[PDB]
Every structure is written in C-alpha cells, then in structure tokens.
Amino acid sequence: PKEPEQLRKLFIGGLSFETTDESLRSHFEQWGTLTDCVVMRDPNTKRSRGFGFVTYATVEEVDAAMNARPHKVDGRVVEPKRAHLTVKKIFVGGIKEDTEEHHLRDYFEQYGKIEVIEIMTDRGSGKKRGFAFVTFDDHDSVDKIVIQKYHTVNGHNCEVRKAL
Numbered sequence: 001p002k003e004p005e006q007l008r009k010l011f012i013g014g015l016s017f018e019t020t021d022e023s024l025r026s027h028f029e030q031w032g033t034l035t036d037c038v039v040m041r042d043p044n045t046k047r048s049r050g051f052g053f054v055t056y057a058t059v060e061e062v063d064a065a066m067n068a069r070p071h072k073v074d075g076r077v078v079e080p081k082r083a084h085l086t087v088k089k090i091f092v093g094g095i096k097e098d099t100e101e102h103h104l105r106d107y108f109e110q111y112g113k114i115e116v117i118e119i120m121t122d123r124g125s126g127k128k129r130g131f132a133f134v135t136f137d138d139h140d141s142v143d144k145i146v147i148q149k150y151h152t153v154n155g156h157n158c159e160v161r162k163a164l
C-alpha cells in the first residue's frame with residue numbers, strides 16, 4: 001500500500017532558470033527514488049518558471065530530502081515545501097488542565113526543533129484553558145504535524161492546526 005501521492009511530493013521554489021528535469025532529478029535522487037520530477041516552464045518560450053516538483057516513492061524519502069536542506073541545486077539555494085501557508089507555529093487544543101510543558105515537548109520534539117511552548121492560562125484566574133501553542137525553528141515540522149490524522153498527547157486526542 002503506497003502512501004497517497006500528494007504526501008510524497010515536494011514543491012521546489014527558487015530554482016535556477018538553468019535547472020532542467022534532468023538536473024533536478026540528479027540532485028534529488030540522492031535522497032530517494034523519484035517517480036516524477038518536473039521543472040515548470042512557460043508554454044510558449046520554454047523559459048523556466050523558476051519552480052518545479054519532485055515525487056518520491058515514500059514519505060520517508062520526502063523526510064530525508066527535507067532533513068538534507070539547505071539544497072543548493074545548480075548553484076542556487078532552493079526552497080522545498082511539502083504539498084502553502086508557511087508557518088512555524090501550531091495551535092494544540094483539547095489538552096485539558098492536566099497537560100504540562102514536558103508532555104508537549106516530549107511529543108512534538110520528534111517533529112522538529114522547538115523554540116517556544118506556550119500553555120494558555122486564563123487571564124483572570126490563571127487556570128489552564130486546555131490549549132497551547134508550539135513554535136518550531138522551521139516550517140516543515142508544522143507541515144508534517146498538520147497532515148497527520150491524529151495526535152495523542154498525555155492521553156488526549158488533540159486538535160492541531162497551523163497558527164498565524
């Protein structure tokens with residue numbers, strides 16, 4: 001059973017206009033099997049639109065490629081992103097009053113490097129409100145997080161979405 005193809009694609013922005021299907025493929029095949037690899041071009045001039053996409057055989061290969069950033073392709077640092085609202089912060093809801101910072105850290109640190117954990121408390125009483133924000137050092141952590149169907153933190157089934 002193959003993962004859905006949409007989850008195996010990387011949009012690559014900021015390409016050199018000299019990058020071709022072939023040179024983009026030669027670069028990104030270092031991190032996995034590519035089932036597709038295309039540079040977007042103008043239909044009339046064939047001049048590069050400066051972006052393209054690659055599709056890996058598995059999600060683990062996408063992960064490998066993203067963990068190998070920054071990618072310098074044909075002399076230019078490019079901008080890969082998963083199949084964009086490009087943010088580094090998530091909202092985590094449904095954590096109730098018993099969820100602590102270490103619960104969130106221990107779970108989310110395996111998605112990316114955490115810079116801020118903010119457990120929300122009531123302005124008047126100081127009681128926990130049952131949600132939190134986590135800020136990572138990079139957007140791919142968030143992109144991996146929000147495409148999961150489920151997140152279980154401290155026994156709670158949480159709602160997780162991109163924040164601001």
Ligand SMILES: COc1ccc(C(=O)NCC(N)=O)cc1
Nearest residue numbers: 063064067109110111112113141
């Ligand atoms: C700092 O960014 C991170 C931080 C952690 C991970 C992680 O645990 N996953 C392993 C993997 N091969 O993808 C991946 C990326």
